[PDB]
Structure formats: C-alpha cells, structure tokens
Amino acid sequence: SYETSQHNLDAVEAVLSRLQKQTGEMAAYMVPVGYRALCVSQRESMQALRCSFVQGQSQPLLRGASSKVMLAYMPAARCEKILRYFGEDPTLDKWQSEFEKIRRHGYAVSTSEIDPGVSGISAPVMKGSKLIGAISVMAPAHRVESNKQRIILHVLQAARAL
Ligand SMILES: [Cl-]
Ligand SMILES: [Cl-]
To answer: Which ligand has its closest atom nearest to the C-alpha of 66?
Structure first.
C-alpha cells in the first residue's frame, strides 16, 4: 500500500475520480523513483483498455508523456543521469527542444511510444519548485483525436488541484 508513503493519496484519489468522470478515460498518478515511473494510483478503464500502466508497477522513465513531463520538470542533473543510463544523450536538440516545449505548455502529449494505438497526456504535480509526480490520462488515439483540448485542460486542472 501507498497509504503511509503517499502523504496525499486521499486528495489524489479524489482528483483522479473527477478526471475520469470529466473525460471518460483512465487516469493515473505517477511518481518518479530512480530510473522508473511508478503508477501510484490509477482509475482503471471502463472500456476494455489494457495498456502498460498498472497500479503498483513501474515503467522506465524514458518514453511517454508522463516520463517526459517528469524529466522536463525535475532538476537537470537528475534528468541527465536518467537519460544517460538509458543510453540517450540529454544535450541533443531532440531532448532539449522537447523539454523546453513541455515547460512552455505545462504538459506533454505522446502517441504510441509505449503501447501502439494508445496516447498519453500528462501534467506535473509540483510542491513549490519540486517535482513530486504527474497526473496522466492514457487513452486510445481514436478518442484522443476527438478530445485532445478537453483532455489537456482537465489534466492540467487535475494536476493544479494537487
Ligand atoms: Cl505514448
Ligand atoms: Cl474507441
């Protein structure tokens, strides 16, 4: 359980519940742990979506909107260590341009980086200047294509509420 380790799980659960009722999509709260993104709380799909994000399990902090938001908002030194572990060169424009874009917008969007046909939209959860986690919606590209601005606004709204 993350009852004693996630200080604000009640608040997180309330935000994710609303977010799914606003978008009709799966939503999760992710936190960075070393080289990986841990899914701490997840709503679960009322459709039949079976993607790689599972509550209590982690993914490498590298691909997808959630990973890219956390990498963009954590300290540079930390971000560099992680990307170098995965064999990426953090100094390249393809990374630096993405992080600048993310910080300008306040969220990231990804498509099919993890699961073919599934997109991610994510925004950082901050405590002051410290990145603590991210709120994300994981949803079929079929639906994101019709609801992109709606999902972005609600994801931003969810993250800001925490
Ligand atoms: Cl993705
Ligand atoms: Cl569908």
So the answer is: 1
Using an 8 Å Cβ cutoff, are 41 and 28 in contact?
yes
Domains, the chain: 1-162 (3.30.450.40)
Ligand 1 center from residue 122 Cα (angstroms): 10
CA of 17 to the centre of ligand 2 (A): 20
In angstroms, the CA 155 to CA 151 distance is 6
Determined by which method?
Answer: X-ray
| Rounded distance between C-alpha atoms, residue 67 and residue 85, angstroms | 14
| Beta strands in the chain, from DSSP E residues, in sequence order | 26-33, 36-42, 58-60, 108-111, 118-127, 130-140
User: What is the 57 CA–ligand 2 centroid distance (Å)?
Assistant: 25
Q: What is the resolution of this structure in A?
A: 1.6
Quote the ligand 1 centre to 4 CA distance (angstroms): 30
The Å distance, Cα 111 to ligand 1 centre, comes to: 4
Strand boundaries in 14-129, DSSP class E: 26-33, 36-42, 58-60, 108-111, 118-127
Q: Is residue 43 a contact partner of residue 20, using CB atoms and an 8 Å limit?
A: yes
